[PDB]
Ligand binder design. Structure first.
Ligand SMILES: Cc1cc2c3c(c1C)C(C)(C)CC=[N+]3c1c([nH]c(=O)[nH]c1=O)N2C[C@H](O)[C@H](O)[C@H](O)COP(=O)(O)O
Ligand SMILES: Cc1cc2c3c(c1C)C(C)(C)CC=[N+]3c1c([nH]c(=O)[nH]c1=O)N2C[C@H](O)[C@H](O)[C@H](O)COP(=O)(O)O
Ligand SMILES: [K+]
Ligand SMILES: [K+]
Ligand SMILES: [K+]
Ligand SMILES: [K+]
Ligand SMILES: [Mn+2]
Ligand SMILES: [Mn+2]
Lengths: 500, 500
């Protein structure tokens, strides 16, 4: 099976790429696996595959860390991501995000039901497993639980059957047969949960699939629209219908090649302690436990030699930056275009801890709008900050066409030199806020509301007559023929490869 | 003579350091020299010495570019700066700034007058030079003039004789015997000029010395207090009295080893066209010429084989970032401490285009103040933004003790995650603004007023009971003995020098 359609094949692809380190000696899931993974993510090293995990029994489980993290070289920086999507490993961010957006104007390709698959190679019923006996990792020293779920896909369906959502949300072991996790507004798992709670008749049928098709875990991390079934979006994006098998104990369907599948229910009534967790913005607040959603596990099925993917998330750079930030930015780009805003590109700079999105403006189109910064800032912020795709983002930075939003140094240059604090900004207090940012949930104001801003780094003539500067840089402040002379004589004169 | 006391010796030191490229074939001062220098500054390469400058006659002049720019290696990143100050080339920023501040609580060491020096080896009177015939560089393709003065020191004295100021301010050739340049409030050259204008009797006696003692050009770029003669501050900092010789045509004194000296007057009445220039924030606005101060040159004296230092300034990284930003930050650190604010460190992040200063707070001291963010932000902003040392700085970022302000990634992390936009900020509109920032002089509001902000990246418990998080990083989220195991087994397992 192709790498983008089968996690086991994705692991092979990373090996083949010289992007994997296989560790075959015993590694402790209590912190060691995650510490190694953390170091990988902070240094952009090869992904670690822990084949000898202390506490692994009857095939559960090996761990792959850093599945969506960065490579060291600039030329294949995003290559792990590219390998989720059948793209060349040198694909740019723009190409990755375009691939992720491509299904938005295509018919869905619904999934195909098949009678079995590798995820049925082994099973454990309700008398045979104990989640506290599996080698679930402690990912950060102060975590409030062993976070089994950092890179699997929750599967829940609306009561009417018309929408089946796939998404990543964290969860940790509660006891032998339960998890607790985050289920928070405006996320689709929360929206579906609320539908079941209003109906009031039963707990939500649920599955959690680990080691799913890489193209599916990417969509699972993207805020595609309300009511859109991710399986059909992934089918359209990849050009192929995904193969799913039915759960044994419920009527949900899971990818056939899933490494590990939990089947059970998400309670409409019960909660349990959840967190704290070392989170995407780089912090953990020890002791900060709160009631979270509670899942009951009735069945486990799994591949022979099952592999659990794991995100050791925190400070730069890991899946919570490369996927949450970039895929939200992608959706925001589309949302602005569909609202008739002249946005060409969007990216969440890593330097902002993916709390900003830079929006590149087609300033020829802006000029024709015959508008002002105040009016344009307000329009952009109202579109983005009132929508779920803007949930995680607290600062939007508007930049003109000279800026590559995929280059954080250029975004920071433009922000710092073109946006006058206060005057060139509009604050938004009456919008949903992202509580996980420390300045929100642990800050001075409401954890769930406000704290957002549009920062206009467009210069005044970009609204009127056009850009009226040149950069004081090598590229723009010297003619072409001089530049090329300099370059051609560079090493000759005494001064100092793309791939590397 | 030591490198910090003699520019010619500084050039040797750079050679000795393997930090110089000597270019002995013809190089055009019309853009080529500055283009090469620009490329050096954007890539942190070796400093260029142009020994064969097209238009060099009778010894005027060779050019040294990038005198205060960065080296590629992390271990001696600031080594050019260190070589201005007799520090080891591996000196940290903290050590450099401490050296620059050290004279603030020492008695001045006044200069020593000597009868001659190398700067008298050659002279050209009022019938023998023409500034339009010298190989003055065109530094950026759209500049409004040939900027002879990017790294020399203007020398002006108060009418009463009690204060002699040394400072860098740009100037360009106007005609055979005049320059025009910036002379703007609140700068000391402007403050002294105003004293002469109020007296109304004569033009200001003036000298401009190029290739001065490196320790003197550093002080020339620092906002030491009003009324303090830089020569005595440099004497105290270096432990030695600087040797000066009298000008021929006026009673000012110049460093004995100056490479090139202009003597003349700064008009109290006349102005001439000045600019535009490719400036420190990375831009030039073509055509944006304004009336500037006008200098008359009556005499040139110079060393045999004189060398003109040149800053090819603009986008990162050059002297306008390494010296303007860092030395302002240094003075701001001291100013806050003298105002009883618990600031331990200050630095202007390069990523902010040196428009921000990050202030590291001793949070134990802050706790004992029993204050709040609103009150503390206001106090800090009032101290800094009402003072000349804060002139160039538009955003102050307050951070706690865990942040290394000399590390821009950490400042950006803290800003982005700990400062809630709006709520955690105080805007300052009734303070002097720095017009050279594009969003000021080419922006939506008053060019000279406002646009400043204090952004509080202290978390709430840092004011009360103490830090209540741990970072989700390798350093803080794993015990010491695990960390060290990981490190010790890193290359063994398969994963990947300080000097490089
Ligand atoms: C990539 C990724 C995405 C996480 C995530 C992580 C990763 C690695 C973790 C597990 C390591 C840390 C926490 N995560 C959560 C999360 N969303 C959320 O509601 N709760 C979370 O706990 N997300 C973001 C979530 O997947 C996106 O917001 C999706 O848009 C949600 O899908 P939906 O649009 O269908 O609701
Ligand atoms: C290092 C450096 C400092 C420049 C400078 C440059 C460099 C390389 C240039 C020449 C390349 C670009 C423009 N510069 C000017 C400037 N200050 C100013 O008033 N006008 C300027 O034109 N400065 C900053 C000035 O030197 C500091 O603000 C000093 O504190 C001024 O000294 P003072 O405190 O004695 O007034
Ligand atoms: K999703
Ligand atoms: K603006
Ligand atoms: K000075
Ligand atoms: K704060
Ligand atoms: Mn969804
Ligand atoms: Mn001064």
């Amino acid at each position: 099976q192709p790498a983008h359609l089968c996690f086991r094949s994705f692991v092979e692809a990373l090996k083949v790429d010289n992007d994997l380190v296989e560790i075959n000696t015993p590694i402790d899931p209590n912190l060691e696996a995650a510490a190694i993974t953390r170091r990988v993510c902070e240094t952009n090293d090869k992904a670690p595959l822990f084949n000898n995990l202390i506490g692994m029994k009857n095939g559960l489980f090996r761990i792959l860390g850093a599945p969506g993290s960065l490579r060291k070289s600039s030329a294949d920086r995003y290559g792990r991501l590219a390998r989720h999507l059948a793209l060349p490993p040198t694909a740019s961010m723009r190409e990755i995000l375009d691939k992720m957006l491509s299904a938005s104007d295509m018919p869905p390709i619904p999934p195909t039901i098949v009678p079995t698959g590798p995820c049925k190679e082994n099973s454990l019923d309700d008398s045979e497993f104990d989640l506290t006996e599996l080698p679930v990792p402690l990912i950060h020293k102060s975590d409030g639980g062993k976070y089994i779920q950092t890179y699997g896909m929750h599967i829940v369906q609306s009561p009417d059957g018309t929408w089946t959502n796939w998404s990543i949300a964290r969860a940790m072991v509660h006891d032998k047969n339960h998890l607790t996790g985050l289920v928070i507004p405006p996320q689709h798992i929360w929206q579906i949960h609320q539908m079941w709670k209003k109906e009031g008749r039963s707990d939500v049928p649920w599955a959690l699939a680990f080691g799913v098709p890489p193209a599916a875990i990417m969509a699972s991390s993207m805020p595609i629209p309300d009511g859109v079934t991710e399986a059909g979006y992934v089918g359209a994006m990849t050009g192929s219908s995904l193969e799913l098998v039915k759960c044994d104990t419920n009527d949900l369907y899971v990818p056939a090649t899933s490494e590990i599948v939990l089947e059970g229910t998400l309670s409409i009534s019960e909660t349990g302690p959840e967190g704290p967790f070392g989170e995407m913005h780089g912090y953990i607040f020890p002791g900060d436990t709160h009631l979270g959603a509670k899942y009951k596990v009735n069945r486990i099925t799994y591949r022979n030699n099952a592999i659990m993917p794991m995100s050791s998330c925190g400070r730069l750079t890991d899946e919570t930056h490369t996927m949450i930030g970039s895929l939200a930015a992608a959706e925001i780009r589309k949302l602005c275009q569909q609202n008739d805003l002249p946005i060409t590109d969007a990216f969440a700079p890593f330097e902002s801890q993916v709390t900003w999105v830079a929006l590149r403006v087609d300033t020829e189109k802006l000029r024709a709008m015959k508008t002002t910064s105040e009016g344009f800032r307000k329009r952009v912020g109202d579109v983005v900050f009132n929508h779920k795709a803007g949930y995680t983002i607290h600062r939007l930075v508007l930049v003109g066409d000279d800026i590559d939003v995929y280059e954080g140094k250029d975004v920071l240059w433009a922000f710092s030199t073109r946006c006058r604090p206060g005057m060139d900004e509009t604050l938004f207090e009456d919008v949903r806020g992202f509580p996980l940012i420390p300045y929100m949930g642990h800050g001075n104001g409401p954890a769930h509301r406000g704290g957002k801003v549009v920062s206009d780094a467009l210069m005044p003539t970009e609204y009127t007559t056009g850009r009226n500067w040149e950069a004081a840089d090598f590229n723009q402040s010297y003619p072409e023929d001089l530049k090329q002379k300099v370059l051609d004589n560079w090493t000759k004169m005494g001064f100092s490869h793309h791939h590397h």
